[model samples]
Target: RRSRKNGIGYAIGYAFGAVERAVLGGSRDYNK
Candidate 1:
């Protein structure tokens, strides 16, 4: 099970991961 368009899926998925990290990290950063 793999989805890769010229092995660039990481960048695409990383964007979602970054968005999630921003959301999660922003919450904690605000708490701090």
Candidate 2:
């Protein structure tokens, strides 16, 4: 349980990724 900075960055990136996915449509592959 060390690298606190890494955790914060990961969570931030994850949230952004979710938003992007939502904007692009609910498809992980996005093969429309």
Candidate 3:
């Protein structure tokens, strides 16, 4: 029960990060 919620949250955060990086070119790479 506890880990399940935590795991899902982490996965969602990671997924958003990946999409933002791919679509937005991320913060570091955007400077170029």
Candidate 4:
């Protein structure tokens, strides 16, 4: 159950990052 919850959390986080990139332009260097 914990793992499933974490997976959902990660998916949400990834979606948020994609939306942020779409709004602000993506990073050229993800390390930065």
Cα displacement (angstroms), candidate 4, residue 4, comes to 4.7
lDDT of 1: 0.68
Number of colliding residue pairs in model 4 = 0
TM-score of 1: 0.41
Error of 4 at 31 (Å): 35
Model 4 poorest ten-residue lDDT run: 23-32
Candidate 2 residue lDDT tens string, 1-32? 68966686799898999888786875556454
Give per-model TM-scores: 0.41, 0.48, 0.42, 0.47
Any residue pairs clashing in model 3, and if so which? none
1-32 per-residue lDDT for model 4 (tens digits): 56856686688898998888785775555653
Per residue, candidate 3 scores C-alpha lDDT tens digits across 1-32 of 57856786688898888887676654544443
* Deviation from native of the Cα of residue 30 in model 1, angstroms: 12
Give the candidate order by descending lDDT: 2, 4, 3, 1
Those runs of model 4 whose alpha carbons end farther than 4 Å from true positions after fitting are 1-8, 26-32
TM-score top scorer: 2
Sorted on TM-score, highest at the top, how do the candidates line up?
Answer: 2, 4, 3, 1
Question: Who wins the lDDT comparison?
Answer: 2
Q: Select the stronger candidate by TM-score from 1 and 4.
A: 4
Tell me model 2's lDDT, rounded to 2 decimals: 0.77
Q: Give candidate 3 misplaced runs (Cα > 4 Å).
A: 4-8, 26-32
- Count of clashing residue pairs in every prediction: 0, 0, 0, 0
